[PDB]
Amino acid sequence: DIVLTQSPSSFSVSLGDRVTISCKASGYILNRLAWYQQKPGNAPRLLISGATSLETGFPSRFSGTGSGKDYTLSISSLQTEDVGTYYCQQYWSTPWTFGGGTKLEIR
Amino acid sequence: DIVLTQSPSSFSVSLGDRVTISCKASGYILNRLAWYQQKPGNAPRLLISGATSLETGFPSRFSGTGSGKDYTLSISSLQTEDVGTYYCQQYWSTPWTFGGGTKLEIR
Amino acid sequence: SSASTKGPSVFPLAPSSAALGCLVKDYFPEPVTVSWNSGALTSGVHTFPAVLQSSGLYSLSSVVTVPSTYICNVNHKPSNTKVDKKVEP
Amino acid sequence: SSASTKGPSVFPLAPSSAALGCLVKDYFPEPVTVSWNSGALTSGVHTFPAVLQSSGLYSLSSVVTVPSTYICNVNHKPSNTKVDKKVEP
Amino acid sequence: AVLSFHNICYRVKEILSNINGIMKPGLNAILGPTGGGKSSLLDVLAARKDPSGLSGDVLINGAPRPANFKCNSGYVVQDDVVMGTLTVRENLQFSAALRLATTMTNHEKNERINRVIQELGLDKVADSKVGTQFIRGVSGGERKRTSIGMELITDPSILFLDEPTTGLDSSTANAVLLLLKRMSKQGRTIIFSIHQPRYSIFKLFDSLTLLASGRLMFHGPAQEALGYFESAGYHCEAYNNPADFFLDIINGDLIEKLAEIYVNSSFYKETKAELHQLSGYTTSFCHQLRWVSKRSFKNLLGNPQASIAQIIVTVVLGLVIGAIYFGLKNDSTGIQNRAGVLFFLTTNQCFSSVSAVELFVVEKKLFIHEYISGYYRVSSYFLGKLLSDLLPMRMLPSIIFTCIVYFMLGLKPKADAFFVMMFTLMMVAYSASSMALAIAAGQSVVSVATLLMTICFVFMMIFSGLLVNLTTIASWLSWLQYFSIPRYGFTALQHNEFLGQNFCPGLNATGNNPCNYATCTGEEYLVKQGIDLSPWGLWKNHVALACMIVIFLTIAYLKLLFLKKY
Amino acid sequence: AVLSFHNICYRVKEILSNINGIMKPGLNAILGPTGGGKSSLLDVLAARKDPSGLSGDVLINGAPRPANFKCNSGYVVQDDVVMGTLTVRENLQFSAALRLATTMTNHEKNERINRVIQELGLDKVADSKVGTQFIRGVSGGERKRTSIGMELITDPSILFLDEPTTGLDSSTANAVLLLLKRMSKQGRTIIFSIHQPRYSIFKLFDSLTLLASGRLMFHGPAQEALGYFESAGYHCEAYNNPADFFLDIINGDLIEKLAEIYVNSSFYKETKAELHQLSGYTTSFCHQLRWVSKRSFKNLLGNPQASIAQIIVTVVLGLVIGAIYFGLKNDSTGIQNRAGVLFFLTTNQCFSSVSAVELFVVEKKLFIHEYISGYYRVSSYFLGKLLSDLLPMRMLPSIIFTCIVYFMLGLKPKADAFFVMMFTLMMVAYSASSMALAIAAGQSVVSVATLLMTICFVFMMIFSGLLVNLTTIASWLSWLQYFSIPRYGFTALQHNEFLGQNFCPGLNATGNNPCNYATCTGEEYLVKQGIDLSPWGLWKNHVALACMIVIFLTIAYLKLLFLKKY
Amino acid sequence: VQLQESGPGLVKPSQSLSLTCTVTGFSITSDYAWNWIRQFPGKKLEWMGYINFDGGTTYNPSLRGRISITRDTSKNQFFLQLRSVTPEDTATYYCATFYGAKGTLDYWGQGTSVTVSS
Amino acid sequence: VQLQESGPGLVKPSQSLSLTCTVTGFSITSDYAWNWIRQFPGKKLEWMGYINFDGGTTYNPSLRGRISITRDTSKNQFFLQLRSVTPEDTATYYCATFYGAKGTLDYWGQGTSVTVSS
Amino acid sequence: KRTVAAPSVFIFPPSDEQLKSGTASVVCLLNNFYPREAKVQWKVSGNSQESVTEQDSKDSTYSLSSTLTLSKADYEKACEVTHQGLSSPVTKSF
Amino acid sequence: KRTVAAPSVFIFPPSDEQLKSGTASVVCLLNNFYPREAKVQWKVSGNSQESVTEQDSKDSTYSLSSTLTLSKADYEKACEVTHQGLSSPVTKSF
């Protein structure tokens, strides 16, 4: 199967700053990568589908900019609504797999 | 190549009536069928795209209901805005082909 | 047409000095056929493609080319108006 | 949620009649480590998962299970608040 | 009966120039160098050569040979054509079943067989197998006796033997010729050719005919030949064999001298006077079909390679395919797997059917001998061999493959779909096998037919529809697809599997496809291969395979009908 | 030189029991039935049999045979191994090039060849070809003389011939033995076996040795044998050959009785006395490779099927493929066409390489004779035959296919892509050919090796990656893919074609795909086949093919190193 | 469109776990594939399997023989049944919809916790 | 998005016809395929060919060897060039965009007439 | 391109027979013109009709025709063509 | 299912040493309860923090701990636990 690594388990960033989350695949994923945001006490919510397309209902402050085996999620000008845990997921190979998750513990 | 037949060259219909236009293919088309409306002096305008799906910016008074080799375009409760020439087109095989066109004329 | 059956008006016009034109003005249902000298001269005819009006009627322009007696007549269909018109030599 | 670097408050509470709990209240940055009898006892410890507050601060609950002198002390890293607390037998 | 040949000439270019002689009850030998007349005279005397070249006259008891003569006389081939996997009793029974009249009770035929098998001294081997590659059995001398007994069934007044000891050790060859001399004393006329006989053999002959380069060198009583050549001017020493001394004279220790002396010699004038003094189906088609089929079936059972080996390879390959393709999916790989496994199954039926080249080729010498001897019609032979050998060995592997693979792969779980696969795998095997028989029939060697078969299938397999999309080929090649056996099989199997399958999980593409290129159902795959979605799109392939069977089995029959027998 | 043998016994189970004799300048014949000692005694005397069984002693002029003896004596095979597409001059030149010392000038070797070719009476055929399937040439008598001359190059004091008259007509067999008697008068000791000589041959012999069932039955001067057997109690008539009369006595008109008589006979005691009066590389590797390669190249040029026919088939098949796949598209059919044409090209290099089975198998008898005779090392032979035959006939068809198909199809229009295809087609041909030589080397028949090769390629071709998607196979079979030659070729070709192609017209799909399942670029196709998109994903396949070449060419060499020569 | 998990929140070791999911605003036999996903106490996510709109089904190899998914098309239900349950998993369980053409989990239930222990 | 045909409206028999199409609001090298379609006097439609976003091109077999389509990526132009023009194929010529994933001609120019006569 | 042209224009007035009917159909024929794309305008504006036809059989010029339908109250009281291939338009009166 | 158990509750009051500092951390420990999911309320709130830890290592119940931060002006003037495993809360005072 394919394993996803998110390199930091947690961050520490100030409000209003830029932040960038990295997801590394073991195999080639050819942009079949999605990002999920989870607020505590709720289901994961889809944020990006395909490596680069943003879901309707999120602001253009978010964008994804990966290719090949290395993928990344950018927030430019992060805001107080963005605090949470972020996961990448591959959907190339039928045993679908999430990254370990990374937590933006806004400080 | 694939030839499309529209059976009548022209109709004759009253306002508020129901009308139904038939397109027959020579080969199997597997719903790769589109309909175009042309007003005189203008380019053809796309109406249905894939045998059953309707374009945003047309009334739900139109719908297409084909399968296999035989396809049809229905108008229930036609109106004065609908008068014109209608063509089917296949987009299955690489030499794309239109039906001979059929004209709606008021009665 | 907005509505059901009515028969054509017909008028042949004599030339300046040559060609003969007869106009078959407003009619429906539309499958009109036109005859010159009742079929005695089928050569050199051009019926121009018919018009459509804002009422939805149709009009047809019938022409012959010939250095010149003549008849323009029209066996029009559901109206049975077998319209007939004449000119002098 | 905003933390500037600030060190923990610490308090051990003696039991009813047994287990000892010391609470390491509000602190940041978060890499805290807690020590019982300054490392002379390590069996039967449970540090409960830490909280987070609306200010952005963290809190940790340290417990020992033992039929009982004791020290709770905390070698917290980025503020040199090496906090130390005692109970009598 | 006395057999007399007068002014015999034969041309293909002459090979027998002018020959005169008489042959009589007793043991009569035809000798000379191998390229000489020796074999061709035997085959003229026996009516085994084409009458178009023959320019003299042959009489029996002073009357012409009847056209029936091939049925009333025995002829024994040099290398034995006997069935090596039947027993001696069974080989004689097959000859008796077809050369004797239909009038006779089985006991009246066994009286004939028992008189024959006792007279030949075969009693200790009557129920032993006649020996094969996989079966040790009866020895080469007894194998030669067995072949003689197949001709003695009819009580022939004349026996012809081609080279009867040219293949046996000297201590066997003397026992074979001592057996033949005891037979000659029964009043049978025995006529035979030989290669360089020992003095120990040459003493037995009742007449000698000697031939070189299509000229007669001597004809007369056999023991007079030495005195004739010593009178003609040659010399034999002590310790030297006359039969080698004659071929030495022919080889110049010139043939115009030896021919002219014989024309002047006393033995010619006596022969010429004698010749001027002398010049004064059995059975139904059904019974032939029954016995041909029966012998052919015992032969199939008496062989490991033609039966057990192909069944074992089928079961093993069926389980290997069953493991590699285990549990087919309805996903992005499911089309590739179903296309590739069905393409393996049809092309494997073609290349495993190349073994049908061997059906008639290995039997060719036996067929021509038995056909000339009047055993059967070409119709009852050809049908009796299809019905016995080809039919069961093409049903079995088709049934076995289908029973093993079908439920391991998880192909469509419907009863008629399973039987349509089984019937389609079986039609492609008979069609490929019939093409092999059309290429092979009448040829004498397996290798050229096997190559031509293999070359045909690699070109047919390009036009199969897996490797190239047939809808894309230029119109001036495109009609070549109608000639391909693998394509009709593969199209029928793809039609049967793919109809009503889905391959995009989570996407119901049945009423529309939301993005044009996705290829999400088996109907989209079928039309993209140019296949017809109607029930006639399935069955059109089976009528095409039935036509290729009928055409190729006719070409195979007409090849045996117009083969040169002589 | 006199060759003497004392108390010879040999066992595989004994086959020579106890044998004693002396052989001398002159013409010495070994006779008896075919299964007797006759051939095994010749091969013991000649040192052509394994010393592990030999239990007696053999002795030349009163001194032991040296280990060098195989190089100092001539041995002529029964069926001639001479090069049928070289000339008589060239066959003698190849023997002279390797059996004479490196000291000698080409004129000093041609003096040896001229003395030999004149003494054999070959002068009218010195520049004629020695005869082949496609080439009429020198007749069987002069073909036998040519084989004798290849041994006379060294002036051997002893000649051995197995069965020298067997397979020749009686006038030729006399001319060969008359030639041998003239050679014996030069002081050479000539020792040979015969199958039943004519009286006119038997008069020539200077000694006779007679053997049956591994017992000696006479040894002495040849003309005394008749008087010995008539004294022992048998009778010869007039008109009968002594040489047939001896084998008749051995056949019982018992061998223990006839062996006991010989032990008591005068000729034994006289022989036993003398046997107690007695007993009281040449050349570099480079020169061998040079001449082996040269003979092998002249042989390749002297044959149509091994050269011209494979080139013609390659050009025709290249243009047929070039027409069917003409002008590849970037549409929904373009993946199927590129996958299928590249799969045809690699599997065709495998099945056309099955002809490499024939390389060593057809030369086996010639190799074993020349190796035992000390012509060359196994290393210089094996390399000199790879370098000459296998190397050019696997470059050419790979270059031709690439030049024809590439620009007809319109494969990637880049210089390095064209040369990577050409190199990949060439590596898969050498790898498949090396596997053929590993299966074939040391075997005696083409058919079993050809079947085993064909069975290997159909299993390798399932694991190629077209017919089954390799990412889906169960883990306990999946490791079988690493053993397949077609897969490394096909993976390297697919990598080279598909990178940077697009297959969905009117859609860009480099940064995203609007709907999944669509498969719109060659990278999506490659990763869906489990192929690696890095440059190591291309080259990994060529290091794998180079390893399979080195392993299989080592197995082919070790098979010739440990083959049984005796 | 809308989903809701339900079932027993507490189960014995070596027994079988069972959750219903009820769907509204869409038909489970019209389109899409219907998933189960679990989130551990260690906050990692595991995807468990699906049932497709045609009733075909697929599972994560980590759950070999333990899992099956089934449906009742009479009332838009599908069910997770997970046998030989063990205290080492003890996760929060979600049903979700896989959109097919887009490739993503677009709609989720609120999820339900399951406790497993002695 | 926005298309516009231009060129000579009148041409000689056996000459070459030539139309430019200029695109605005989108880039011709970005995504789609770019078509030419003609409508005859006595209305019927014929599709003529395309150039793709990568510069690959395809033609109707009715126009064998007569047609080519080419582009200038400096200024979002593509061109119909049709040689050996004949009075039998006077028509109204349109450029249009083929959307690829959807499969339809979604955007059209207003079209331009061409007259051919002796 | 056949050789470029202006129009030529002929008025088609009523017969001595037609005027008995209370209305008239006065007409204007446009002939020999090129390349197809004239227009007609009527003077002395309602109930106008016009139509156009293909190339002529010997020079390949076009033909066009147009109508004014008119009453006995206003007949006894002209067509003009804005063809752009002229230097300026042409007119004639019934 | 371990056997079901409504909580046990122990108050954790300040030492003889702590009250010298002007503020206090007064605490309430929840122990032996099951299955995880209880809550704590503070009497004589807002100044509160709490956590639940993992299963106990020998009887496989749970532990939880909770706090109030308080002043020398208001310490010397209880925690109540709500759990559904019995029909009522339980309470004790520092």
Short mmCIF file of N, CA and C in Angstrom, two decimals, chain F residues 81-120:
data_model
loop_
_atom_site.label_atom_id
_atom_site.label_comp_id
_atom_site.label_asym_id
_atom_site.label_seq_id
_atom_site.Cartn_x
_atom_site.Cartn_y
_atom_site.Cartn_z
N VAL F 81 32.34 -35.94 -40.29
CA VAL F 81 32.04 -34.65 -39.63
C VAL F 81 32.61 -33.44 -40.38
N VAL F 82 33.17 -33.63 -41.58
CA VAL F 82 33.79 -32.57 -42.40
C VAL F 82 32.83 -31.42 -42.71
N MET F 83 33.35 -30.21 -42.88
CA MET F 83 32.54 -29.02 -43.17
C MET F 83 32.03 -29.03 -44.61
N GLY F 84 30.75 -29.32 -44.79
CA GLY F 84 30.12 -29.49 -46.10
C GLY F 84 30.01 -28.23 -46.96
N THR F 85 30.28 -27.04 -46.41
CA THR F 85 30.21 -25.76 -47.13
C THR F 85 31.56 -25.05 -47.27
N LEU F 86 32.61 -25.57 -46.63
CA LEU F 86 33.99 -25.25 -46.99
C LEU F 86 34.42 -26.14 -48.18
N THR F 87 35.52 -25.79 -48.84
CA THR F 87 36.15 -26.66 -49.85
C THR F 87 37.18 -27.63 -49.25
N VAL F 88 37.64 -28.63 -50.01
CA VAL F 88 38.61 -29.65 -49.57
C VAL F 88 39.93 -29.01 -49.11
N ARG F 89 40.44 -28.04 -49.87
CA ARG F 89 41.58 -27.19 -49.52
C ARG F 89 41.39 -26.49 -48.17
N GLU F 90 40.21 -25.93 -47.91
CA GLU F 90 39.91 -25.21 -46.66
C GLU F 90 39.78 -26.13 -45.45
N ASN F 91 39.17 -27.31 -45.61
CA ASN F 91 39.07 -28.29 -44.53
C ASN F 91 40.47 -28.77 -44.09
N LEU F 92 41.34 -29.11 -45.05
CA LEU F 92 42.73 -29.46 -44.75
C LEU F 92 43.49 -28.28 -44.14
N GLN F 93 43.31 -27.06 -44.64
CA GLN F 93 43.92 -25.86 -44.06
C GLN F 93 43.50 -25.62 -42.61
N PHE F 94 42.23 -25.82 -42.23
CA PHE F 94 41.81 -25.67 -40.83
C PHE F 94 42.48 -26.71 -39.93
N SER F 95 42.57 -27.98 -40.36
CA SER F 95 43.32 -29.00 -39.61
C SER F 95 44.80 -28.61 -39.47
N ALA F 96 45.46 -28.21 -40.56
CA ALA F 96 46.85 -27.76 -40.55
C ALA F 96 47.08 -26.51 -39.70
N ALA F 97 46.12 -25.59 -39.66
CA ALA F 97 46.20 -24.37 -38.88
C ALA F 97 46.25 -24.61 -37.37
N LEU F 98 45.78 -25.77 -36.89
CA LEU F 98 45.62 -26.06 -35.46
C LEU F 98 46.38 -27.30 -34.97
N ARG F 99 46.63 -28.31 -35.81
CA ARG F 99 47.37 -29.53 -35.41
C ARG F 99 48.88 -29.45 -35.63
N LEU F 100 49.34 -28.66 -36.59
CA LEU F 100 50.77 -28.39 -36.79
C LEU F 100 51.27 -27.32 -35.81
N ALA F 101 52.57 -27.28 -35.55
CA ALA F 101 53.17 -26.30 -34.64
C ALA F 101 53.06 -24.85 -35.16
N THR F 102 52.97 -23.89 -34.24
CA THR F 102 53.01 -22.44 -34.54
C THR F 102 54.35 -21.97 -35.13
N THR F 103 55.40 -22.79 -35.02
CA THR F 103 56.73 -22.53 -35.61
C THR F 103 56.72 -22.36 -37.13
N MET F 104 55.83 -23.08 -37.82
CA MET F 104 55.92 -23.33 -39.26
C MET F 104 55.35 -22.19 -40.11
N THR F 105 56.09 -21.75 -41.13
CA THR F 105 55.62 -20.79 -42.14
C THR F 105 54.42 -21.34 -42.92
N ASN F 106 53.56 -20.48 -43.46
CA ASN F 106 52.40 -20.91 -44.26
C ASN F 106 52.79 -21.81 -45.45
N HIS F 107 53.94 -21.56 -46.09
CA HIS F 107 54.52 -22.42 -47.13
C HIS F 107 54.95 -23.80 -46.60
N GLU F 108 55.46 -23.87 -45.37
CA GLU F 108 55.85 -25.13 -44.72
C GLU F 108 54.63 -25.96 -44.31
N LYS F 109 53.48 -25.31 -44.07
CA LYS F 109 52.19 -25.97 -43.86
C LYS F 109 51.54 -26.39 -45.18
N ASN F 110 51.62 -25.57 -46.22
CA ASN F 110 51.14 -25.94 -47.55
C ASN F 110 51.96 -27.07 -48.19
N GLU F 111 53.26 -27.18 -47.94
CA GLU F 111 54.02 -28.39 -48.30
C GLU F 111 53.43 -29.66 -47.65
N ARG F 112 53.06 -29.61 -46.37
CA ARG F 112 52.36 -30.72 -45.70
C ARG F 112 51.00 -30.99 -46.34
N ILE F 113 50.19 -29.96 -46.58
CA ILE F 113 48.87 -30.11 -47.21
C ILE F 113 49.00 -30.67 -48.63
N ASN F 114 49.98 -30.23 -49.42
CA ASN F 114 50.16 -30.68 -50.80
C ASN F 114 50.61 -32.14 -50.88
N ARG F 115 51.54 -32.55 -50.01
CA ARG F 115 51.92 -33.96 -49.88
C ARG F 115 50.69 -34.81 -49.54
N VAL F 116 49.85 -34.36 -48.61
CA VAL F 116 48.62 -35.08 -48.23
C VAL F 116 47.57 -35.11 -49.34
N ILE F 117 47.21 -33.98 -49.94
CA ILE F 117 46.11 -33.91 -50.92
C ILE F 117 46.43 -34.65 -52.24
N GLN F 118 47.71 -34.71 -52.61
CA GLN F 118 48.22 -35.52 -53.71
C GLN F 118 48.19 -37.02 -53.39
N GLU F 119 48.68 -37.42 -52.22
CA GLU F 119 48.71 -38.83 -51.80
C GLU F 119 47.31 -39.48 -51.73
N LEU F 120 46.28 -38.71 -51.38
CA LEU F 120 44.88 -39.15 -51.35
C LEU F 120 44.19 -39.13 -52.72
#
